[PDB]
Each structure stands twice: as structure tokens, then as C-alpha cells.
């Protein structure tokens, strides 16, 4: 049965390693785990909805899943205001039911179905060292991922659109009719620097680029899936990789760690696919909002904000970036690359325009600045809003903080897991994962260093 | 045989819990110290000694409970229950901080009993007593910090209170008032502690990654026999690995394990010496040349001068509440602060 | 074939220091970072770290000593912008804005990641088990947290840890002021990791030294009783297990040396993993526990706790840190 240490070589704390060469039970483990994921999605959505106050902003209510559905244009109107709550309920309920179905399948294949799929079928039975079968399964899953990307495209283009925080008038659910299919624009994001001002693919700032990139990634994933169904790994690929289950797991672990770090930076910096109406302001957004708020207040009191000198000699409200752009002064000089829909009407060719600052600041911009200043993504582990020195009065930690922290923890641990499994796959393929053979110790056959 | 020999035979009998002659000192004192800490953090306030809530009964959590030190006006009183301050009143004794002196003294004699236990068991089983010698460093730390440091100061009040957030207060107090990070003895202590953690991790990983294959199971923990005569890992392979990775490597196992003894013990002893220096307020607070230059030149700035400004902030902003016996009334206009914030 | 000969030299286990391909990346980056660090620590001009035209002197030639000297982080005006030498108009502008810090930290992070990879590589070439690099991933994660991840979360490389002793102390104190790291459970796990690592290091060393088998006289050192490459164990693990099992109780003592050494590896590595994650999660401003004004009496008066005294100390550091850099009431980043 391979369910003890003696017959399998693995202790109980590595007991899932007993599933490596048992395709049916491994499939059961995977399907049950997918059921767990869908279960969390549905149950968490229903939990969030049950404690959802529609007239309070989503980022004040500890919501991470409802903002995702809102970003898809479901249940929201202009300005991010919730107009209907039933789409959130539908998403949660359908995930809960589908998770029951997936849990049934996982349990069946894990404890009742055949332990190996090779005798039952040749289509579903696989060997880890059969490279063509591995590429065939990879191709099937690439086609599925491409269809998912095209499903996002279909939602954006034909099924109501997406929430656009950059939409003219204040942000609204908009149908994307002209996606950016230009490969220079799309693949210019991939060759952009990850550093300040550039920000790589995290810096995508319009839904047209998002939909065009998703068209490209859906078509590329479908094409690569067909490629791997039709082809076999080449000689350089066969010589460059370890071909085993733990090796493929380690490759996926490295990929997932990289994706986790990317998602952390995406939720921390991007306010386009993570609109600040739903997720709250970013840190740069909140700092710029504080500078804007006190600029407005002192300008109302009569200060000449263009000529006001701070304690150090720099501009108290307005200064210059290292490349000359007129930016907000103070420590928020670090955040001068921030772009937001509430701040862009005041920005001219040379940065913040003094004339627009003096007479074009509207009350909605001031309300947005005050709201984003007082909902900065700073909070305690017990969810006390503000800096670490604040007193207990405000129950607030930003969803951006929760998502970024959790996915950095997960991405780092998955990098560690990738290192573990990559080293172990190399050692097991080379044949010394269980230790050094006493009779054939390699170092004893090597010349001395000195 | 005699009553002494029969009693010695009983005390040294093999049990689940060894007692020994040292047990008579260890088990009462250690049990009372632990029970006093739990009793204090569960039921006893600091309202009359510090003006603080410090028990679960007052609504504090595990991080914020403490058995606080006695009030400053008590001085270095032993604060015995029958002593002239409490006069046998257990309730007043708890309210006056007598539980702190109870825990501190019972803990000191419990640590003495534990090192005597180490010596006694080492003598009984026939091993060298290097564990007691290693345990001298925690005893030195406890004596320097909880006994020598308040004895140098005005009272028991400035000793650490037995609690998590109270110990954090002790850390921040030493930063603000002593500049304890700048003290080279504390630097040697940090070096010893972090080097001991490094040596622990690196030696464990090196042993686990140079194991001989002594079994067919993938989980290698089964392959070790406690009574086997052979080494369970390859010292030659480990030496070559670290020689080619780091440049230098251990080649003597006995020297390796003595070094693992030596590093954190020496670090803790150096930090205890520094704590005695701080008991007399003999701080490594300032570099005189940098002070002279910064005083005569308002453009000279280092991270050390910034740390001094931070220490001034710590002292001014925490002194009225951390030292309520001084009756510090600092008006808002005398508080040092930067622009805005 | 020349490329085959170069590959054989690079992966050779007969070199005094192993190179490997992780080494062909590691050696130039670490040499560049080391040379730039020595030159900057000795002779760099003062650096405007806060971006407020108040340069901080960090090198020995400009009035520092070993304790107070540092390589000062790059300017807050730079923020997260990439600032190589060729992006400056001159070397004097590059030195004024803190370019050496960026050069050193980027080269050091690349070199240390390749050091981890090189540890794996040599373990693979020698037929070892491969997880020494996993143990080294904990200090590497700590270095990434303090040099890269905290600047990324705060939005400026000026908030990264300075390359010096007193600058490190400044980093610690300001971090406690703004994030209450002491009240964060990940840092408490890290303190448990390092304290336990020192404890178990001293414990394992004292237990092995205690149970050393007599192979010498009182004249000579006991270390000469061990010979390099001997098959027999130099100490009696049964005697040490008997001693430690009588010290606490029997089942608290390891009798398996492999399990014991795995525990020695695992405790500080997991603790330092959690404290590096603590620094990163406070970089995204998920701060330590806030218990200020938590205890309230019947009328509503605030009853102070030790957390409130910590809050007073944090307030002192907060109001005094970067005393000229703030124009607005909230220190958002």
C-alpha cells in the first residue's frame, strides 16, 4: 500500500512523498487540494459579503476578494460605489458548490480509485521520466491557461467591461473596445527596468494595455500548448534539465516564488488593476495625498505655495525632481513617480502646474486627498490604524498591506522550497540523496587542496 | 551506613526526575520563582510601584504582563514578607513589589542549584563538567543584569521587571540613557550570540548534509545507531567543502565543539562586564573628539550624532512616565522634537 | 576544445577555492562590492541621505572612526530610482547623492545569492546532500530584507540599512520608532532563534566536550586525541545522552545524533527566516502589536501598561528622527 515508512522509505512527516509514483492517489491529492482552494474562495467571499457594509469603502472592511470581483466590473458603478451585491454572492456560492464537486473527486481518487492510472489508461497514466507525456500534459494545461486569459479578455470586451479608475469623469465600469495589440507597447513592458520611475510590468496604467497583453498571453499560451502537444523536448533541453517529479515540482516552485514577489509589488504599487477605490491608496498615493492636502489647506489660508521655503531650504510644498519635474515637497519627494486619477488634472508638461494648483483644484480632489491621507496603508498586526505610535481608536489595516505581506511570506517560503526540491532532485538523480557511500566516498578519491 | 549515607543513596537514585543533593536547593527555589512569576503576571498589579497595570486580572495580555520591580523609594530593600516594609501582610507585600525580590532571589538560588545539579550529575555519570562551565555565562548575565545593575543604581526599580514588554522597556531605556549599542562589551556580546547561532545552524546543516548512507530509507534519521562506533557523517568531505567554499574549515572535531562552547559563553561574559560598567553609569556613551568637532562645526554630521539626538528624544519623552517617583513635569515646549512630527 | 577546457577548470574540485558558474558570477560582483566598500568607507565625501541638502559624513578621512563610519545610503531624492555611475553627470554628483551605496548593495546581493548557489554547486560536485544552501538562505533573506525589500516597501533606498555600525544602530532605533519591531511576533521568533541558537550551540559543544573519550594526558591538549579522518567517534554520545537525560528528564534528550544535528540546523534557521519575513512585512507597514490605551478602567481613564512606556520611548525616537526632513504631521513612509 506504500503507507508506512518500511515499504516506502519516507517517514510520516514526508508522507506525501509516498505519492510520487502513485498516479491515481497523486491525482486525488491534487483534485482535493483544488477543491480546498475553490472552497476558500467561495467561503471567504460569502464571509466577506455577510459582513459587508455597502456604504463603507471596501478597504475599510478587511476585504480582499470582493475588490477582485469589483475590479472585474461586477456589482459596482461610478466611483466604485456598490450598486448590486448579488454578483459577489453568485461568485461565492458557485465556488462553494464547485468545491464540493472537486472534493468528491479528490476523495474518490485518493482513497477509492485505482492507485496507479497506467493500467487503466494510457492517456491518463503517466511516467515522470517520459518527456513527451510530460510535455503533452503541460500543453493541455497551457491551452487551459490561455483560455482563462481569453476569458478575462471576453469579460473586458463583450461581457460588461472592467472597472477603469482612469475613466473620464471619475472611474467607472467601461468596455474595452480597442486593446493594445502592438507588440512594441506590450513587450516594451517586459524590457522596462524594475527600478524607480520604470517599474517593469507593474507600471501598466491603462486597461487597454491590460486587455492587449492578455490577448497576447492567451494566444501565446494556446500556441505553446499546441507546440508541446505536437513536439518532443530537444537534445539541449533533455541535457539541461532533470526529468523527475521532484524536479518538475522544484521548477514550478521557483516560478511560483517569482510570481509571488511580482504580485506583492503589483498590489503595493499598481493602482490601475488594483483600484484605490477598492483596495485603498498605495503608500506613494497616501504620501502624495498628505502633501496635496496640506498644500490645499495652506493655500486656502493664503500661503504662496510656490515660494514657501521649508526648514532645509527646499520647497515646503513644491520642489524639483532630479530631472526637473515640479513635484510635491518633503519626504514624499521619494514618491514623485506616483500617478493617480485625482492628481493628474493638476499635472502639466513640466510636472505640477502652479496655476492649476492655485485655481483648478476641485472639492472631489480635496476629499480624495484627505481620504487617502487618513487611510494610508500603515497599521498594526492587531489592526490598529496609523503609525506604530498611534493610540487604539481606529480599526484599519489596508488590504494592500495584507496582500503584500502575505504574498511576500509565501513567495520567500516557495523560493526556499524550490531550493530544497531542486537540490534534492539533483542529488536523487545523481544518486546520493540518502548520504555518502562509505566504500566510495568521492572526496577520498580527490587530491589534496594543499 | 548512617543517616547521611542512606539519604545520599535515596537522593541519587535513578528516577524520571533526578533529585540529588542539589535538588534540595534547586526544586524549591526554581519552583517558587516560576510560580511567583505566574502568580504575579496573573493576579498582581504594579499600580502602587509604577502606576501600571501588569496582570491578566487587569486586562493585560501575555506580552504586556510583568512582575514589576519595587518602587524607587524602597531602595535596595530585600523586601522580605516578614520585613519592616510589609510586616507580614501578604497583600501589601504584593502591592509593594515584594514578589519581584522574591522571584529575583529565588531565581538566583535556583540557578545556583541548577549549576550544582550539573556538577552533581556530571560527577555521577562520569563526564567532564563543561556544561556547568558553559552555564556560568547565563548565571553571569542574570547576576549582572538583575542583581549588580540595580545595586549600582538607586534602587531595585531600575532592574528589569519580569515581563515581555517590561524587558523591551529595559532595552529601550538602555539605548536612551546608556547608549548600550555603542558599548564594545555589548558588541562582543552580540558577536558571541550571533556567532553561536551561526555555528549552531552551520554545524547542524554540515552534519546533516555530509551523512554517510547507513540505511536504505530516504528519511536518514533511522540510519543512526546510538551505540555505534563509527562516525555518522564524513568529516573529510565537510572539511573539503568548507575549505573550498569559505577558505578555512575545521579539521578537529574536538576543537570544533569546544569552539561552539567558547563563542556564546565568552560573548555573554563580555556583555555582563559591560552591564557592570553600566551599573556604575560608566558608559561608552560618546566619542569626545566627535563631540568637540560637532559642537564647533554645525555641518559635521554622522550616524552617531543622529543616534545621540534619538537618545535625547527617548530620555525626554519617556522619563515622566518611566520614572514616576521623580515627579517629572516636562512642559510641551521643552520636549525636543524635529520639524512637523 | 577551449570551451570544454574552460568548463573543466570552472567546475573543477581541485581548485583551492571552488569557482563554479555561480562563482563566475559571484567573484566579480563580490570583488567590485568589496573594493567599492573599502574605498567608500575610507575616503567617500559626505552623502545627502535625506535628500534635504544636509550631507552625512561616513568615511574615515572625513572625521569618523571604525564605530561611527559607514557607507551612507543613497539620496531620498533618488528614491527607488536606479543610480549607476553613468547616470550621474560627474563622479562628484554621484558621490554626493550616495551612488556607492547602490553599487555596493546591488553587487553584494548578487554575489551573496550566487554564494548560496555556489554552496549548492560544490555540494553537488562532492556527492553531498544539498541543503547547506537552505541554511544559508536565512542570513541571505535577512540581508535582502534590510538592503532591498525594506527600501522597496518604503519607496527609497535611503531607508535601507547603512553600511556601518552606528548607521546600523540608527536603522534599528528608527525601525523601532516607526514599526514597533519588538512587539512584532516575527522578531520575537527571531530573538528566540538567535538566543536558542547560542544556547544550543553552547549546549552541544559542552555536551560533546564533556563526553570526550580519553586519548591524551594532562600535559597535552584534549584536541590531539582526535585525528583528522578517523573512523571512530571521538566522544561517547551514550554518556552525553545519559547526562542530559538526567539533567532535565530522559525523553527531553536526543539519543539520535542525526535528529540532534537537524534540530541544531533547524531552530536558528527557522527563527532567522521568520525575523527576515518580519522586516519584509514591516516594510509593507504591517507593524508590531499596538496595545496603546488598551487597558481602560470603569470610568474610562487610561491605565498605562509597559506597552505605553514603550510607546513613550517610540514617540521620542519618532519625533527626533530625521529632524529636518518632515513638513507634514504624519510620517507615512
Amino acid at each position: 500500500t506504500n503507507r508506512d515508512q518500511e515499504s516506502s522509505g519516507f517517514a510520516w512527516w514526508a508522507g506525501n512523498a509516498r505519492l510520487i509514483n502513485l498516479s491515481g492517489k497523486l491525482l486525488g491529492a491534487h483534485v482535493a487540494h483544488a477543491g480546498l482552494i475553490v472552497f476558500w474562495a467561495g467561503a471567504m467571499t460569502l464571509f466577506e459579503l455577510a459582513h459587508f457594509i455597502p456604504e463603507k469603502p471596501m478597504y475599510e472592511q478587511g476585504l480582499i476578494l470582493i475588490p477582485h470581483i469589483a475590479t472585474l466590473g461586477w456589482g459596482v458603478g461610478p466611483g466604485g460605489e456598490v450598486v448590486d451585491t448579488f454578483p459577489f454572492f453568485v461568485v461565492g456560492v458557485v465556488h462553494l458548490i464547485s468545491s464540493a464537486v472537486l472534493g468528491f473527486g479528490g476523495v474518490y481518487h485518493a482513497i477509492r480509485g485505482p492507485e496507479t492510472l497506467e493500467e487503466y489508461s494510457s492517456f491518463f497514466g503517466y511516467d515522470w521520466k517520459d518527456k513527451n507525456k510530460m510535455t503533452t500534459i503541460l500543453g493541455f494545461h497551457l491551452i487551459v491557461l490561455g483560455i482563462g486569459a481569453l476569458l478575462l479578455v471576453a469579460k473586458a470586451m463583450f461581457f460588461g467591461g472592467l472597472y477603469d479608475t482612469w475613466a473620464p469623469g471619475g472611474g467607472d465600469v467601461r468596455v474595452i473596445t480597442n486593446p493594445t495589440l502592438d507588440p512594441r507597447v506590450i513587450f516594451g513592458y517586459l524590457l522596462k527596468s524594475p527600478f524607480g520611475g520604470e517599474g517593469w510590468i507593474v507600471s501598466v496604467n491603462n486597461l487597454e494595455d491590460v486587455v492587449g497583453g492578455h490577448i497576447w498571453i492567451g494566444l501565446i499560451c494556446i500556441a505553446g500548448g499546441i507546440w508541446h502537444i505536437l513536439t518532443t523536448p530537444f537534445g539541449w533541453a533533455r541535457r539541461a534539465f532533470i526529468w523527475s517529479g521532484e524536479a518538475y515540482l522544484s521548477y514550478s516552485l521557483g516560478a511560483l516564488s517569482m510570481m509571488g514577489f511580482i504580485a506583492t509589488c503589483f498590489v503595493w504599487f499598481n493602482n490601475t488593476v488594483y483600484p484605490s477605490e477598492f483596495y485603498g491608496p498605495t503608500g506613494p498615493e497616501a504620501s502624495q495625498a498628505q502633501a496635496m492636502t496640506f498644500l490645499i489647506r495652506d493655500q486656502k489660508l493664503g500661503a504662496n505655495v510656490g515660494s514657501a521655503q521649508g526648514p532645509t531650504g527646499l520647497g515646503k510644498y513644491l520642489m524639483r525632481s532630479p530631472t526637473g519635474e515640479i513635484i510635491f515637497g518633503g519626504e514624499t519627494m521619494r514618491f514623485w513617480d506616483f500617478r493617480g486619477p485625482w492628481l493628474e488634472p493638476l499635472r502639466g508638461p513640466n510636472g505640477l502646474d502652479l496655476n492649476k494648483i492655485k485655481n483648478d483644484i476641485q472639492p472631489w480632489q480635496e476629499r480624495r486627498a484627505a481620504e487617502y491621507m487618513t487611510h494610508a496603508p500603515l497599521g498594526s498586526l492587531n489592526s490598529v490604524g496609523g503609525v506604530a505610535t498611534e493610540i487604539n481608536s481606529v480599526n484599519f489595516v489596508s488590504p494592500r498591506s495584507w496582500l503584500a505581506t502575505s504574498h511576500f511570506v509565501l513567495a520567500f517560503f516557495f523560493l526556499v522550497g524550490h531550493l530544497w526540491h531542486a537540490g534534492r532532485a539533483r542529488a536523487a538523480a545523481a544518486g546520493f540523496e540518502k548520504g555518502i557511500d562509505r566504500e566510495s566516498e568521492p572526496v577520498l578519491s580527490m587530491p589534496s587542496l594543499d | 551506613r548512617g543517616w547521611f549515607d542512606i539519604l545520599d543513596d535515596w537522593l541519587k537514585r535513578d528516577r524520571f526526575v533526578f533529585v540529588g543533593w542539589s535538588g534540595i536547593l534547586l526544586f524549591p527555589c526554581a519552583y517558587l520563582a516560576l510560580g511567583g512569576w505566574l502568580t504575579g503576571t496573573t493576579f498582581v498589579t504594579s499600580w502602587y510601584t509604577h502606576g501600571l497595570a501588569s496582570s491578566y486580572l487587569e486586562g493585560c495580555n501575555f506580552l504586556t504582563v510583568a512582575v514589576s520591580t519595587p518602587a524607587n523609594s524602597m531602595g535596595h530593600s530585600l523586601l522580605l514578607l516578614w520585613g519592616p516594609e510589609a510586616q507580614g501582610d501578604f497583600t501589601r507585600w504584593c502591592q509593594l513589589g515584594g514578589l519581584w525580590t522574591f522571584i529575583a532571589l529565588h531565581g538566583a538560588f535556583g540557578l545556583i542549584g541548577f549549576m550544582l545539579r550539573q556538577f552533581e550529575i556530571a560527577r555521577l555519570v562520569g563526564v567532564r563538567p563543561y556544561n556547568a562551565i558553559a552555564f556560568s555565562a547565563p548565571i553571569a548575565v542574570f547576576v549582572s543584569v538583575f542583581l549588580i545593575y540595580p545595586l549600582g543604581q538607586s534602587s531595585w526599580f531600575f532592574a528589569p521587571s519580569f515581563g515581555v514588554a517590561a524587558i523591551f522597556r529595559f532595552l529601550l531605556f538602555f539605548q536612551g540613557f546608556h547608549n548600550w549599542t555603542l558599548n564594545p562589551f555589548h558588541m562582543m556580546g552580540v558577536a558571541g550570540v550571533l556567532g553561536g547561532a551561526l555555528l549552531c545552524a552551520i554545524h547542524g546543516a554540515t552534519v546533516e548534509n555530509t551523512l554517510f548512507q547507513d540505511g536504505e530509507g530516504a528519511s536518514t534519521f533511522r540510519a543512526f545507531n546510538p551505540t555505534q562506533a563509527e562516525e555518522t557523517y564524513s568529516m573529510v568531505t565537510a572539511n573539503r567543502f568548507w575549505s573550498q567554499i569559505f577558505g578555512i574549515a575545521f579539521s578537529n572535531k574536538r576543537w570544533l565543539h569546544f569552539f561552539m562552547l567558547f563563542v556564546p559563553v565568552t560573548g555573554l561574559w563580555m556583555s555582563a562586564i559591560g552591564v557592570v560598567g553600566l551599573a556604575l553609569n560608566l558608559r561608552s556613551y560618546d566619542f569626545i573628539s566627535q563631540e568637540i568637532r560637532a559642537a564647533e562645526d554645525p555641518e559635521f554630521e554622522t550616524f552617531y550624532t543622529k543616534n545621540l539626538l534619538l537618545n535625547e528624544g527617548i530620555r525626554a519623552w519617556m522619563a515622566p512616565q518611566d520614572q514616576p517617583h521623580e515627579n517629572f513635569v516636562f512642559p510641551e515646549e521643552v520636549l525636543p522634537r524635529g520639524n512637523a512630527l | 576544445n577551449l570551451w570544454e577546457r574552460f568548463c573543466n577548470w570552472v567546475t573543477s574540485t581541485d581548485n583551492r577555492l571552488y569557482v563554479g558558474w555561480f562563482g563566475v558570477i559571484m567573484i566579480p560582483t563580490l570583488l567590485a562590492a568589496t573594493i567599492c566598500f573599502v574605498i567608500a568607507f575610507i575616503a567617500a565625501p559626505p552623502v545627502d541621505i535625506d535628500g534635504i541638502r544636509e550631507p552625512v559624513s561616513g568615511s574615515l578621512l572625513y572625521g569618523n572612526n571604525i564605530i561611527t563610519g559607514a557607507v551612507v545610503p543613497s539620496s531620498n531624492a533618488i528614491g527607488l530610482h536606479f543610480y549607476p555611475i553613468w547616470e550621474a553627470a560627474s563622479l562628484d554628483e554621484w558621490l554626493y547623492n550616495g551612488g556607492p551605496y547602490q553599487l555596493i548593495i546591488f553587487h553584494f546581493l548578487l554575489g551573496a545569492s550566487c554564494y548560496m548557489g555556489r554552496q549548492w554547486e560544490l555540494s553537488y560536485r562532492l556527492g553531498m546532500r544539498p541543503w547547506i544552501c537552505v541554511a544559508y538562505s536565512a542570513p541571505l533573506a535577512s540581508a535582502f530584507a534590510v538592503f532591498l525589500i525594506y527600501p522597496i516597501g518604503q519607496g527609497s533606498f535611503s531607508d535601507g540599512m547603512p553600511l556601518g555600525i552606528s548607521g546600523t544602530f540608527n536603522f534599528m532605533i528608527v525601525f523601532q520608532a516607526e514599526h514597533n519591531i519588538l512587539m512584532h511576533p516575527f522578531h520575537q521568533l527571531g530573538v528566540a532563534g538567535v538566543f536558542g541558537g547560542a544556547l544550543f550551540c553552547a549546549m552541544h559543544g559542552s555536551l560533546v566536550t564533556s563526553s570526550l573519550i580519553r586519548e591524551t594526558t594532562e600535559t597535552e591538549s584534549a584536541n590531539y586525541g582526535y585525528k583528522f579522518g578517523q573512523e571512530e567517534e571521538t566522544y561517547n554520545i551514550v554518556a552525553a545522552h545519559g547526562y542530559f537525560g538526567r539533567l532535565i528528564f530522559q525523553y527531553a534528550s536526543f539519543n539520535n545524533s542525526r535528529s540532534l544535528h537537524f534540530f541544531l540546523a533547524a531552530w536558528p534557521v527557522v527563527g532567522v527566516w521568520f525575523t527576515a519575513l518580519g522586516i519584509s512585512t514591516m516594510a509593507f507597514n504591517l507593524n508590531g502589536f499596538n496595545f496603546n490605551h488598551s487597558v481602560i478602567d470603569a470610568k474610562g481613564n487610561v491605565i498605562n501598561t509597559w506597552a505605553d512606556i514603550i510607546n513613550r520611548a517610540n514617540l521620542g525616537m519618532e519625533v527626533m528622527h530625521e529632524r529636518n526632513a518632515h513638513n507634514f504631521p504624519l510620517d507615512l513612509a
Partner: peptide, 30 residues
């Protein structure tokens, strides 16, 4: 003279690093 002292001690440390790595006692298997 203080800067010279610090740099001299550091240089002696680096020289000791060189001698400890490349002119060590060679570990001989026995």
C-alpha cells in the same frame, strides 16, 4: 594618525586572511 591606525589594523587582518587560507596547516587524513 587614527585613520592610519584603523587602515593598518584592517590591512593586517586581510593579510592574516590570505595567510590563513593559502598557507594553513594542510589537513592530512589519518
Amino acid at each position: 594618525m587614527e585613520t592610519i591606525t584603523y587602515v593598518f589594523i584592517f590591512a593586517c587582518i586581510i593579510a592574516l586572511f590570505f595567510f590563513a587560507i593559502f598557507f594553513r596547516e594542510p589537513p592530512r587524513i589519518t
